[PDB]
Symmetry: C2
């Protein structure tokens, strides 16, 4: 295929890209990379991504080699998702896109505490503190969804793609949270999307 | 009554606010600033939290487009696409992405390392400094500078052929790090780029102010 994706399936950031590719019905070749798969710390990979992280996406059609999951999602949307996942109007686009930055700058670090502490390990305090932080972030997201159906606004979009893989993990590590009805309604609509069920709804490991 | 269509909330010594001030100045857009953050308050008021539940700055209102927007990088990309076509916005998705990745990286990778140093040397007195943490922050930032130096080996700007929003995202952090009394391993491509920035009137106006 013209598109190559490096990354493992149990990565939030890789999931964003796999999910976008599936939503847009784009063909791609996956190369397992990260963790016990290696590849991502090889000299040849570091020449493509000096951070040595996944995902990495190559698009031979546009001579593109791109890292940063959110940039990859926005690229795929603009290039292949016109009138589907790309919002043309800058202001309406921004209202959704802010949630991409927020997903990685605010939600991800709180999520990391839980995924590390519970799944891939423990420090009662640490974790309990991360749970409180995530519960508070869930309150914020619940309010954000009080008057619109999607983080991207009127329609499902790239803000929703950025946030949901983290939320998926947090709702599947045996924890029970304060009920958040707007957030839960939103999550249910994601579970109805075949691409989400395929890519995101897999075991937490 | 001398009021503008764009309102910006935030204090001048914030990296994230600087990105937006700098963009507004590059595009020669009129704006009204409302000081907010730190000792200025405003950002934890109920009225402000209703606009930005994170209670952080910057926040930008654009009355022309009925927009109320937080996240500095999203604000910069908005201004570029709306007001900076053929100046700061790169139309081609792939060529745009090559620059825009550096916006994500600035805030996800550079910012946390910068934060250690800014908090430690600028906003903590010597008697309370964690010298170990600062030294580790310095090591980390020196390694990130090596990465940025290599990235600039074969192109003039993070945004590619021309100055752009990837450059805007990275530079305010680099400015602080170069103005806190530290000497770094030389990085010739990074230094050449930084000098380029110092020749831009909007950068001199907004970014090149005292580190406090
Ligand atoms: N800012 C990057 C973060 C990427 C990242 O942290 N990737 C992780 C997986 S979630 C990784 O490569 N970890 C090292 C490994 O798996 O070997 C992005 O959003 O794409
Ligand atoms: N992710 C946000 C982060 C904003 C942020 O951290 N703002 C800081 C200033 S750099 C702030 O508001 N601190 C609280 C304060 O100044 O009271 C963005 O990029 O705009």
């Amino acid at each position: 295929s013209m598109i190559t994706l490096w990354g493992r399936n149990n990565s939030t950031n890789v999931k964003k890209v796999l999910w976008t590719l599936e939503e847009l019905e784009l063909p791609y070749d996956q190369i397992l990379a990260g963790g016990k798969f290696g590849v991502n710390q090889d000299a040849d990979y570091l020449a493509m991504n000096p951070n040595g992280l996944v995902p990495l996406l190559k698009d031979d059609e546009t001579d593109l080699l791109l890292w940063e999951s959110n940039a990859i999602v926005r690229y795929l949307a603009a290039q292949y998702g016109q009138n589907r996942l790309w919002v043309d109007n800058p202001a309406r686009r921004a209202e959704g896109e802010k949630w991409m930055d927020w997903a990685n700058q605010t939600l991800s670090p709180a999520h990391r505490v839980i995924l590390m502490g519970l799944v891939r390990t423990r420090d009662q305090a640490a974790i309990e503190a991360g749970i409180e932080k995530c519960d508070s972030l869930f309150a914020l997201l619940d309010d954000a969804l009080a008057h619109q159906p999607w983080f991207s606004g009127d329609n499902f979009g790239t803000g929703d793609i950025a946030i949901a893989p983290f939320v998926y993990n947090l709702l599947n590590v045996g924890l029970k949270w304060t009920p958040r009805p707007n957030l839960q309604r939103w999550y249910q609509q994601l579970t109805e999307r075949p691409a989400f069920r395929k890519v995101v709804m897999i075991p937490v490991t």
